[PDB]
Design a protein around this ligand. Structure first.
Ligand SMILES: [Cl-]
Length: 136
Protein backbone atom coordinates (compact mmCIF):
# COMPACT_ATOMS: atom_id res chain seq x y z
CA UNK A 1 0.00 0.00 0.00
CA UNK A 2 2.79 2.53 0.85
CA UNK A 3 6.09 3.32 -0.94
CA UNK A 4 9.12 5.40 0.16
CA UNK A 5 9.50 8.64 -1.85
CA UNK A 6 9.08 12.45 -1.92
CA UNK A 7 5.55 12.64 -3.35
CA UNK A 8 2.42 13.20 -1.22
CA UNK A 9 1.08 9.83 -0.17
CA UNK A 10 4.65 8.42 0.07
CA UNK A 11 6.55 7.35 3.18
CA UNK A 12 9.07 10.08 3.86
CA UNK A 13 12.68 8.72 3.69
CA UNK A 14 13.98 8.23 7.28
CA UNK A 15 16.51 10.74 8.59
CA UNK A 16 19.18 8.80 10.55
CA UNK A 17 21.83 11.52 11.50
CA UNK A 18 17.14 12.05 15.15
CA UNK A 19 13.55 11.86 16.62
CA UNK A 20 11.18 9.86 14.31
CA UNK A 21 8.31 11.24 12.13
CA UNK A 22 6.04 8.44 13.36
CA UNK A 23 4.47 9.02 16.80
CA UNK A 24 1.39 8.03 18.86
CA UNK A 25 0.39 11.67 19.62
CA UNK A 26 -1.09 12.82 16.27
CA UNK A 27 1.85 15.27 15.91
CA UNK A 28 2.76 16.42 12.37
CA UNK A 29 6.30 17.29 11.17
CA UNK A 30 7.25 20.17 8.90
CA UNK A 31 10.46 18.94 7.22
CA UNK A 32 12.24 21.86 5.55
CA UNK A 33 15.52 21.96 3.55
CA UNK A 34 17.43 25.19 3.09
CA UNK A 35 20.96 26.67 2.87
CA UNK A 36 22.41 30.16 3.51
CA UNK A 37 23.70 30.05 -0.15
CA UNK A 38 20.02 29.86 -1.39
CA UNK A 39 18.48 33.23 -0.47
CA UNK A 40 14.89 32.04 -1.21
CA UNK A 41 15.17 28.86 0.98
CA UNK A 42 16.63 30.98 3.79
CA UNK A 43 13.69 33.47 3.69
CA UNK A 44 11.09 30.60 3.53
CA UNK A 45 12.80 29.01 6.54
CA UNK A 46 12.27 32.18 8.69
CA UNK A 47 8.63 32.49 7.60
CA UNK A 48 7.87 28.80 8.25
CA UNK A 49 9.66 28.73 11.70
CA UNK A 50 7.70 31.83 12.84
CA UNK A 51 4.41 30.25 11.60
CA UNK A 52 5.11 27.01 13.61
CA UNK A 53 5.59 29.19 16.76
CA UNK A 54 1.79 29.98 16.52
CA UNK A 55 1.06 26.28 17.38
CA UNK A 56 1.93 24.03 20.33
CA UNK A 57 4.65 21.31 20.30
CA UNK A 58 1.83 18.70 20.44
CA UNK A 59 0.34 19.76 17.07
CA UNK A 60 3.46 20.30 14.92
CA UNK A 61 7.21 19.91 15.07
CA UNK A 62 9.50 21.82 12.78
CA UNK A 63 12.56 20.04 11.45
CA UNK A 64 14.68 22.53 9.42
CA UNK A 65 17.83 21.05 7.93
CA UNK A 66 20.60 23.35 6.63
CA UNK A 67 22.62 21.94 3.71
CA UNK A 68 25.52 24.44 4.16
CA UNK A 69 28.86 22.54 4.33
CA UNK A 70 30.32 24.74 7.16
CA UNK A 71 28.84 24.48 10.70
CA UNK A 72 29.96 28.10 11.43
CA UNK A 73 27.83 29.32 8.44
CA UNK A 74 24.79 27.40 9.88
CA UNK A 75 25.41 28.77 13.43
CA UNK A 76 25.87 32.46 12.35
CA UNK A 77 22.81 32.31 9.97
CA UNK A 78 20.41 30.76 12.57
CA UNK A 79 21.66 33.43 15.10
CA UNK A 80 21.13 36.32 12.55
CA UNK A 81 17.66 34.97 11.53
CA UNK A 82 16.74 34.56 15.30
CA UNK A 83 15.25 31.09 14.80
CA UNK A 84 14.26 28.59 17.55
CA UNK A 85 17.46 26.52 17.91
CA UNK A 86 15.42 23.41 18.89
CA UNK A 87 14.04 23.26 15.26
CA UNK A 88 17.29 23.99 13.33
CA UNK A 89 19.54 21.08 12.30
CA UNK A 90 22.67 20.86 10.24
CA UNK A 91 23.75 18.22 7.73
CA UNK A 92 27.52 18.85 7.49
CA UNK A 93 28.02 16.82 4.27
CA UNK A 94 25.68 19.10 2.20
CA UNK A 95 25.32 18.08 -1.51
CA UNK A 96 27.51 15.00 -0.81
CA UNK A 97 25.02 13.69 1.83
CA UNK A 98 22.70 10.66 1.30
CA UNK A 99 19.87 12.93 2.54
CA UNK A 100 20.37 15.45 -0.31
CA UNK A 101 20.11 12.58 -2.85
CA UNK A 102 17.19 10.83 -0.95
CA UNK A 103 15.04 14.00 -0.97
CA UNK A 104 15.97 14.83 -4.64
CA UNK A 105 17.33 18.24 -3.46
CA UNK A 106 19.15 18.68 -6.83
CA UNK A 107 15.65 19.72 -8.10
CA UNK A 108 15.69 22.47 -5.42
CA UNK A 109 15.15 23.09 -1.70
CA UNK A 110 11.73 21.88 -0.64
CA UNK A 111 9.55 21.33 2.45
CA UNK A 112 7.21 18.46 3.36
CA UNK A 113 4.31 18.20 5.78
CA UNK A 114 4.59 14.67 7.25
CA UNK A 115 1.75 13.13 9.35
CA UNK A 116 2.12 10.99 12.58
CA UNK A 117 2.48 7.85 10.38
CA UNK A 118 5.50 9.27 8.47
CA UNK A 119 3.47 9.83 5.28
CA UNK A 120 3.94 13.04 3.20
CA UNK A 121 0.53 14.75 3.16
CA UNK A 122 1.71 18.06 1.52
CA UNK A 123 4.79 19.45 -0.30
CA UNK A 124 6.18 23.04 -0.58
CA UNK A 125 3.63 24.40 1.89
CA UNK A 126 3.47 28.20 2.43
CA UNK A 127 3.08 29.60 6.00
CA UNK A 128 -0.54 30.51 5.05
CA UNK A 129 -1.40 27.00 3.70
CA UNK A 130 0.42 25.34 6.67
CA UNK A 131 -1.90 27.20 9.13
CA UNK A 132 -5.06 26.38 7.04
CA UNK A 133 -4.02 22.68 7.04
CA UNK A 134 -3.13 22.55 10.82
CA UNK A 135 -6.49 24.25 11.73
CA UNK A 136 -8.58 21.62 9.83
CL1 LIG B 1 12.67 9.95 10.66
Amino acid sequence: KLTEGVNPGDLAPRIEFKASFHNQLGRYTLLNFWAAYDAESRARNVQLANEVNKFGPDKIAMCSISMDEKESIFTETVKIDKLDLSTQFHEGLGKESELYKKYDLRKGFKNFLINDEGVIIAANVTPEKLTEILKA
